[PDB]
Symmetry: D2
Subunit: 387 residues, 4 copies
């Protein structure tokens, strides 16, 4: 067999559909959605109709049953158009992943099945105002009371928080402070219409402005025991396990934004003249473009490797964290270099690059910060070492 | 003789006044001005009343007669509060500089003197839609017709463009395409109320949102010959010469923003706990803060050196471009590191750091981009060896 | 089909053979060869015996007929042991490549066939004292005189220069100064025993000290017309074309050195204690190692991509230059970080890391400098937009 | 009062003497000393005769009584010639500093006075095979036995280790493992001819090859109580205090090396032509040179600031560690950039730049590693914000 860097024919078809959608539908309206902060309902509904959403849902639940490699290639194309739109769409896959990997047949048919019938959204609730990077520090409480659990806590920065039909929620189920992380938490599926759920205001962030991000308070929220993933205490492994499939998709989003910044900068450098030459003819500008192209290519291969590893049935933690760390860093470098190449125009809102700079910063923060990715890569590298 | 890194007592007093003003008056309202994009008239008027504006105006024009070193120390304090507010105030010094260095007695008394009597603004017009870095590429035309020049052209990105009482304007006066840059341009003082001037829209930029930045159109604008700086063809040297005094001030602005980012990140890192420890206790975070402190200290000394050089009566081109290049780069690095240290909160508009990231990017672009600063440093550096 | 990051079974067997050879035979003697600068004849002979040399030689010439991907995986394992030894071995592939890609059957059987029978070395001569990066600037002359060419010129920095059985030589064949690069040069195969070939001293470089690097002068050297690759004027395309297959192999060498630096630093960090903890327990050290691991992994995939592209029958210029630029940079960053992690011991010659720092620098210079790789990437990138 | 970046007339005279010596005497022989590793006795003796060595010794001990600023300006000029030669000379100041700052009149007259009479060397012994960065981890024992201390332990990497007339030595005097660092150690002046001191082989390092660096064993070495600096347990503060005056001098050494790399690269770039132009005309090369010039200028001001701080009577820990961290980093960047600009010639030993790359690495390691400098700067910075 051997190495191959060629997509299958089906993958080329998915890529073509996602690219056409991003170019014809997302790009022409993304600046307006970023200005208004309006949730991009028409684009989400069109992505759903084109089969570009909920791609991991198994075929037996009415889904496409695609793998992580397929989700990444779609995600890169959507992100090229807008990561605000792509984050809303990807948010569904983040909420669904714990059910896909740890749900029983009933939970999958009920909660994933509904997503294949209508363009509903879902969300995942882990982060709290007091703890984000430190998942083992979460304080939202889950207490078993007969055939149900009572949830009390506050979650923060929830993507699709105000639009979700249901949430994946991680809560502390063991009151013992000495309980190890792998036994202390429970993962739940929570219907959004449950009494006691209080959704907060839309948060106003620097970037991905059309994505919906909110705080949510859970006050004595009743959850049936049938909505527990695996069982009491299995929450940490379910939530951590879901990153193997989602982290390469997030890295692909950063790559799409980076590719957009590179394309905008190159096209501008081929039109703008200074000192009697096109910008591409000034060696400092050509060297920047060369370095930007090197970074995009290497970041793309990093997510492709992480996606192929998990699709091959292997744990991909090391590769997925390398991809998230590297793609997150280079999306930020490319976005500021693209603003730089456009000069005064680059700093201006009528040009498309300043939005990319505002959007890119989230890739060093959400879904495991740059520092957390380094902590993971360090642990995996040190564990792999042998004389 | 001998090195010294201690301010004079008068300089400590100016620093204290500017610091108190930035911390008590600018900081509490800067987020609201960034949200609305409203021109910060009350703050500008208060800075003017406190003697923090137009500092280079000579004492014989009713000014304070301070030097570049004094302007920088004030600029750093104001920028710490908000670079949108500081850029509006600094814009006056950018417009005034060609008059201070090249104006005759009448031009200085008339145009600088009025600034000491009322909190008027001024602006400088060099950049055009077609040329910014390439000053020798400007196409705004100045045609001599008797005792006046007729100006035709469009200028772009002018700080205080819609608020200025008058402009410094650079225009091409030699129609011959083979005319060298040192003979082809003429610098003018142009009153903003002159018929034929059309002030454009407020440009909506990523950062420094409360600063007024506008395109300005000149259609058959009549300028008296008495408003020419030095003479026909001296424009390029006047405009280039003005950077010696303004470039260290722009670098000081970047330093103030960088110091603000460092302070916000350090204070947050002493309050936020993760994995059972304050962020400062995680070595990666302490190393980040140490590197950020190193960069701010070095960038501050870079502008101090460039300012002292010009105040000492030496050309400071090499030091001023090192300061602008380095301070511009580190303000950007520090602003993104401060957003990083605050995490999710850092990305949010209720915290002060994302504004710093949006504001910082202009320091790599305006008043000579990062690339242009490197071209200047290389030329000055290489000149020492040949 | 679809993507795959799994080697073939045959590739896993080659990797195992090369790894065992590097770890058991190269590593224990590499420090001694670096100290003496002795040409590593016993290791070269063992690599030849094991089938780890001249891997691109076609099966019809008695060779293994392996592709670029196979050559890269072997190169990475050898380089991990020592890039001085790996450069001597790789030097054979550099000299053979123009014959592999552009030789006729006679040239291939004669010159490649002899390499499969005995562990002979060969070399490639392009660089001159006056031109290295600028291949179109070469001045070595080739004058056609009946059925032979007369070569006159000086070549510089030739790997295996004093050990080669034959050379690939690029010379200017068109004396017209207006002749374009694609018509001005001719590529030749030159027997090393030809009268007129004068070998210089062994150059003493900072790193890869056991590799043989020498200047070579050709004084009225007679080369038969049957030794011309393709024909008069085809030299530039032959020499440029050879980089498609060799550049990923050079990048793989840089990755091997980088992997060795990472492994030596990690082993040390798992043994050395400071402040009551192993070095790995200090977050700054663990962050370092994480970044070093990220860089090695990405650099490895970059050469694997470039090697697969050319093996699949596509021009790989863009991917090959990305790989050489990135792997060359990271080998240098990793080697200095490894010296850093070992502290005082790292700076000392009894530890293995200072040799890695000295060896790594060549990867930013030979086989197309870091700057030249960026010029190539820029040209290939921009070409996609028109 | 008011800032000034102008040297005094006396400082311009010292600079001129040191520059003439480095350019006429050090530069022409530095490559030979680097090749042979021979200790540069003729250059050290000439530096001593010119008044360029032991500059901090007070005038009442027969010394020049110069400050840290004066020592830095001299150090930069010598380092430009060769940091191997400059480290041997600076080694004297490292050994003398604890006596200058903490010695009593008798100790200063005896140990410093002898250095003003003959070009003797001295050295400082803190580092051990088991601990370098972690000074509080040193295990060399000093057992008080009446009127003397018995020393047992091994020191490693001692500059001028085999050439010293006497050593400053730091040893653990409190056997209690719970003793805090500020009470556990004692600093001594130890005559090199004391029975029980065994000097190891010359260590062969990558760079500064002509500098003498050795391991030293102290086996039942008797040190009189009159040779104790301050008293029992004051060792840690004496050793740490000495860095305030020595750290800016080490940073000045890195700056001299960096300035040499920049000069060699610029001169070459003005002569070498490629693709029809001088290297300076290729924008990537001019941008490199501009960035190298920026770094050298900033690193020079960082040590000048740290030196002025201590000379003005202030603790300069924060500025000195910024200078050592920054100058150490930029000497390494400039040396590799100078090798790069020279191309194949740069990698070759007949050109002067590869020696600079090998020499530069020590500036990130000795006299407090890059990491240790960051730990110091972090502590100094962060503590200012605690209320
Ligand atoms: C727009 C947006 C959308 C998001 N979407 C979701 C979502 O849908 N669901 C959800 O559950 N969460 C979501 N999050 C939360 C996100 O995952 C967190 O912001 C992130 O994990 C960081 O946590 P934090 O903000 O609490 O920062 P903190 O954990 O407080 O960290 C602050 C800083 O310290 C660093 N740091 C922390 N611990 C260490 C350490 N041990 N060593 C070194 N450095 C350290 C971090 O890297 C960071 O730079 C989102 C966040 C944003 C802003
Ligand atoms: C908010 C704002 C306020 C400003 N205020 C003023 C003001 O008050 N008055 C005024 O006159 N102007 C002002 N300017 C204009 C500013 O000076 C220009 O934006 C700047 O000089 C860059 O010119 P440009 O935008 O035309 O970019 P360009 O000159 O088009 O350059 C585009 C890019 O190419 C690079 N580049 C250009 N030439 C070269 C070269 N030879 N080699 C290598 N790289 C090169 C640049 O560095 C940049 O990255 C302001 C700009 C902004 C955005
Ligand atoms: C140990 C060793 C082994 C080698 N082996 C071989 C071999 O076997 N055969 C052989 O033919 N050659 C070989 N070489 C030569 C090698 O390829 C050259 O050293 C290299 O191509 C650079 O050429 P140069 O040294 O002439 O540097 P130059 O071309 O003089 O370049 C000097 C510097 O300027 C930069 N530069 C040059 N032109 C530009 C430009 N247009 N824009 C921007 N930057 C530019 C370069 O990147 C470099 O940093 C070897 C070299 C070494 C040191
Ligand atoms: C040529 C030479 C001359 C010298 N001259 C002298 C001399 O005259 N006298 C003398 O006493 N010593 C001298 N030294 C010793 C020098 O000071 C030490 O090498 C240096 O202090 C580092 O200590 P170490 O080598 O034990 O490294 P270690 O302390 O083992 O550290 C190894 C690595 O880990 C890092 N590290 C260590 N602790 C931490 C931490 N807490 N957090 C993060 N990173 C950490 C270090 O920065 C380094 O990268 C010299 C060294 C050399 C090589």
């Amino acid at each position: 067999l051997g190495f191959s860097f060629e997509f299958t024919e089906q993958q080329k078809e998915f890529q073509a559909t996602a690219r056409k959608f991003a170019r014809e539908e997302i790009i022409p309206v993304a600046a307006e959605y970023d200005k208004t902060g309006e949730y991009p309902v028409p684009l989400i509904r069109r992505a759903w109709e084109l089969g570009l959403m909920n791609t991991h849902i198994p075929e037996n639940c009415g889904g496409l049953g695609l793998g992580t490699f397929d989700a990444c290639l779609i995600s890169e194309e959507l992100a090229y158009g807008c990561t605000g739109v792509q984050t809303a769409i990807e948010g569904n896959s983040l909420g669904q992943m714990p059910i896909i990997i740890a749900g029983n047949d009933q939970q999958k048919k009920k909660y994933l099945g509904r997503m294949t019938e209508e363009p509903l959204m879902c969300a995942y609730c882990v982060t709290e105002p007091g703890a984000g990077s430190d998942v083992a520090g979460i304080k939202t409480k889950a207490e078993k009371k007969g055939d149900e659990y009572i949830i009390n806590g506050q979650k923060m920065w929830i993507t699709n928080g105000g639009k979700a039909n249901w949430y994946f929620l991680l809560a502390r189920s063991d009151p013992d402070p000495k309980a190890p992380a792998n036994k202390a938490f429970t993962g739940f599926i929570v219907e959004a219409d449950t009494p006691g759920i209080q959704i907060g205001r839309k948060e106003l962030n620097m970037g991905q402005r059309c994505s919906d991000t909110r705080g949510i308070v859970f006050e004595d929220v009743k959850v049936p025991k049938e909505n527990v993933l695996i069982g009491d205490g299995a929450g940490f492994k379910v939530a951590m396990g879901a990153f193997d499939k989602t982290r390469p998709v997030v890295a692909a989003g950063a790559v799409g934004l980076a590719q957009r910044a590179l394309d905008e900068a190159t096209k501008y450098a081929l039109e703008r003249k200074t000192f009697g030459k096109l910008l591409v003819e000034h060696q400092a500008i050509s060297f920047m473009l060369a370095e930007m192209a090197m970074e995009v290519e290497l970041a793309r291969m990093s997510y492709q490797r992480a996606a192929w590893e998990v699709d091959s049935g292997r744990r991909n933690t090391y590769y997925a964290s390398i991809a998230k760390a590297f793609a997150g860093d280079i999306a930020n470098q490319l976005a500021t270099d693209a603003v730089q190449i456009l000069g005064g125009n680059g700093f201006n809102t009528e040009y498309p690059v300043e939005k990319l700079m505002r959007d890119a910063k989230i890739y060093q923060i959400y879904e495991g910060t740059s520092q957390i990715q380094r902590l993971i890569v360090a642990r995996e590298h040190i564990d792999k070492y042998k004389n």
